[PDB]
Ligand binder design. Structure first.
Ligand code: ZN
Length: 252
DNA sequence: GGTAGATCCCGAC
DNA sequence: CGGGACTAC
């Protein structure tokens, strides 16, 4: 799930778990648990705590309990469901939080790339994976000025810059490619090569693109198909180690 | 310190 | 082969 999907999850999941008390935590793939390193300590500390809130930072979910926060990332294919402890689990279920009311919060992930970290609430923001996370793309904290400052100080491509979690929180591949197209900027452009005008335009499109989604693709996954604006075949290459889609006419 | 690289998984190729 | 977010040049 990308940022907008994670926000939907945050909004929809909260009422399904708020006020419920954890009675057990069951772990079927320990590698998902990143802190405490010992999955048994992770499970033990959560028992007896009640879910009080659910927040989002980038693509991370932050479950707020009594004492602790659970920081969860779903990566490409992770998903949460709330269901009865009486029913068989769905395939690829790796972590289950059992509540005293007989319901469960279940984490599924066919790829097993997801991560979970638990810390005392007051420590979560200064520990991995939240430490160093950049500003929310939809917050005034993410400004053209902030973007420009990062762009000038690097030799990397503009795409690499936007994918950097320290630059902006949870701005995914699909939105990077779409935003760059809408801004008329080639993904392989050196970040430092962007004019003040281009930085302003890029910020504008980043906010518009992801903002619209949080509330029709031009290039992403459209290689070999005509550009919706000019008819030129969309091309796909590798930039910043990722599949990258662009129109060679609209973007410069 | 900045930057790339190794790293995890497994279904679709 | 792809992909989000600790180690070594
Ligand atoms: Zn075009």
């Amino acid at each position: 799930p990308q940022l907008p999907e994670v926000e939907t999850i945050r909004r929809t999941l909260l009422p399904l778990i708020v006020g419920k008390t954890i009675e057990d935590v069951r772990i079927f793939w320990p590698n998902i648990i990143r802190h405490p390193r010992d999955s048994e300590a992770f499970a033990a500390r959560m028992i007896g705590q009640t879910v009080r809130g659910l927040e989002r930072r980038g693509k991370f979910l932050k479950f707020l309990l009594d004492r602790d926060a659970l920081i969860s990332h779903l990566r490409m294919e992770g998903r949460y469901a709330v269901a009865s402890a009486l029913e068989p689990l769905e395939p690829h279920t790796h972590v289950v939080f059992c509540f005293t009311d007989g319901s469960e919060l279940r984490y599924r992930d066919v790829r097993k790339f997801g991560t979970m970290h638990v810390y005392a609430k007051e420590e979560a923001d200064r520990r991995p994976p939240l430490a160093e996370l950049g500003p929310e793309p939809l917050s005034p904290a993410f400004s053209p000025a902030v973007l420009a400052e990062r762009a000038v100080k690097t030799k990397r491509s503009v795409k690499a810059l936007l994918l950097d979690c320290t630059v902006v929180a949870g701005f995914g591949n699909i939105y990077v490619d779409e935003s760059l197209f809408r801004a008329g900027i080639l993904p392989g452009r050196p970040a430092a090569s962007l004019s003040s005008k281009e930085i302003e335009r890029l910020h504008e499109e980043m906010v518009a693109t992801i903002g619209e989604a949080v509330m029709h693709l031009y290039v992403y996954g459209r290689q070999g198909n005509p550009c919706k604006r000019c008819g030129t075949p969309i091309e796909k290459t590798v930039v910043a180690g990722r599949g990258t889609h662009y129109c060679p006419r609209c973007q410069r």
